[PDB]
Amino acid sequence: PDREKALELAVAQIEKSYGKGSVMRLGDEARQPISVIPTGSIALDVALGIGGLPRGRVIEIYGPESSGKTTVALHAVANAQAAGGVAAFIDAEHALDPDYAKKLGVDTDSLLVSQPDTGEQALEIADMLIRSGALDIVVIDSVAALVPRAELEGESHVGLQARLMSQALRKMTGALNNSGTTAIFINQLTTTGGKALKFYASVRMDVRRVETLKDGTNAVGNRTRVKVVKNKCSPPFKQAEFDILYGKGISREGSLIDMGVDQGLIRKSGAWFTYEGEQLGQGKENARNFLVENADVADEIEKKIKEKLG
Ligand code: NA
């Protein structure tokens, strides 16, 4: 009665004092921004609330080796470019596969890449790149690889990388908000020297393999699962699942089906997926195949899922 106002008044003070998203009810609707960076899965886009990754923000994506985290980041890179943006890849790992990147949709030719000498240089170069104003996205691969110059010069010992990140991030956060650039930090499972990244990041994503998809004895890629453990732009703790196919990446068509049935926009009478009276396919694969062959209906289904949600 008289509490609902005192609560709303307190929530408003918190919002004004520390910014939007400082407090949220988990049932709240996502507040929709002008532009986001789609992730490649509509499922993940919905779990993120705002339909993609936020701009001008620190994003962390973490998981075990060979989990899908990079693939997810490369899809962000592909989508940012497809919207006419520029991308940079700060590489301290040296594992990137550009052919794979190509098949996801990355314009590798125009992808700025840097292979820095030290952890500080990696972040400095990231910073100069961001302050330009010309960059839509920058991926850092990865936190664990940002080894301190001192350590690489064989020279203080404990906490130097953690201090290197904290400092870098303090400066970088402003540059990002001002520039509108998204910075994805990839991280192996304070897991890496990213005790600080945990607090600077506006989105944190936990990526994992759930089960290997099969096509006989030799299968195909994996069913991936992402939890949005931190989300300052929409209520957190949302999970999403989607498929990553070896050589292809995230099955956009697969996420449309799943979320299609989830929303009742697609009906599954037996093994037959149907859409607005028409049949899509028998079994998931045929329905998936039907959607790549007919991009018109795929976009049709995508348009309908977005409307129903945001
Ligand atoms: Na790769």
Side-chain angles (χ1 to χ4, degrees), residues 1-2 6-7 9-15 17-19 21-30 32-64 67-101 103-148 150-154 159 161-162 164-170 172-176 179-187 189 193-213 215-216 219-266 269-283 286-302 304-307 309-310:
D2 200 12
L7 185 51
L9 226 162
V11 169
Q13 292 183 89
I14 291 161
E15 222 76 341
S17 294
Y18 308 106
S22 303
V23 64
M24 282 178 283
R25 297 187 186 77
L26 297 175
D28 289 343
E29 298 290 346
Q32 287 289 316
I34 283 158
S35 60
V36 297
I37 297 162
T39 58
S41 163
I42 189 72
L44 180 50
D45 292 328
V46 172
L48 284 161
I50 66 173
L53 291 179
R55 292 172 166 271
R57 250 68 172 179
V58 172
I59 283 52
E60 182 180 22
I61 316 183
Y62 68 93
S67 61
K69 46 172 149 62
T70 306
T71 295
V72 170
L74 294 174
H75 277 282
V77 170
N79 293 335
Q81 288 172 325
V86 178
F89 197 99
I90 284 55
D91 177 36
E93 214 63 75
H94 314 152
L96 179 61
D97 180 348
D99 291 334
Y100 182 58
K103 293 159 201 165
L104 306 195
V106 175
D107 182 1
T108 52
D109 288 342
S110 23
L111 183 71
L112 285 164
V113 175
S114 173
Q115 286 183 327
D117 309 334
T118 59
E120 21 271 314
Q121 182 178 303
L123 300 162
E124 269 148 34
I125 291 171
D127 180 87
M128 295 176 201
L129 230 36
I130 294 154
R131 283 181 206 283
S132 79
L135 228 74
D136 279 32
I137 187 163
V138 48
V139 189
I140 294 85
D141 197 14
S142 71
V143 170
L146 308 181
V147 184
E151 201 191 307
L152 295 164
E153 284 171 347
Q161 196 205 47
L164 150 72
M165 284 282 282
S166 293
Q167 294 169 359
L169 290 171
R170 185 221 252 227
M172 190 178 295
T173 233
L176 293 166
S179 70
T181 302
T182 306
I184 296 172
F185 280 88
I186 299 169
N187 201 355
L189 217 170
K195 177 91 271 224
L197 175 67
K198 190 173 169 168
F199 298 80
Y200 283 99
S202 288
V203 176
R204 295 181 80 244
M205 292 188 294
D206 179 323
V207 179
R208 270 154 191 169
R209 262 129 125 263
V210 168
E211 68 179 53
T212 77
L213 306 160
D215 193 32
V220 140
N222 294 262
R223 167 129 281 209
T224 304
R225 175 187 299 165
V226 181
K227 184 178 177 184
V228 187
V229 304
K230 192 185 187 178
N231 192 350
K232 301 305 300 285
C233 297
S234 181
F237 313 126
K238 295 284 171 52
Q239 298 210 148
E241 296 186 0
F242 52 84
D243 304 314
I244 294 174
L245 309 173
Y246 292 131
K248 283 106 156 64
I250 292 172
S251 169
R252 163 159 165 280
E253 290 77 28
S255 254
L256 291 159
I257 289 172
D258 296 327
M259 288 301 302
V261 328
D262 185 57
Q263 299 306 292
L265 257 44
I266 301 185
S269 60
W272 289 86
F273 294 90
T274 83
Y275 177 69
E276 295 209 344
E278 190 197 28
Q279 72 192 27
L280 296 178
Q282 193 170 34
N286 285 309
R288 175 201 268 105
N289 289 308
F290 178 79
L291 291 168
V292 60
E293 292 171 350
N294 301 107
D296 45 291
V297 59
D299 289 45
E300 227 272 296
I301 290 167
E302 190 177 319
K304 303 214 80 175
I305 293 164
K306 287 185 185 174
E307 287 167 28
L309 264 38

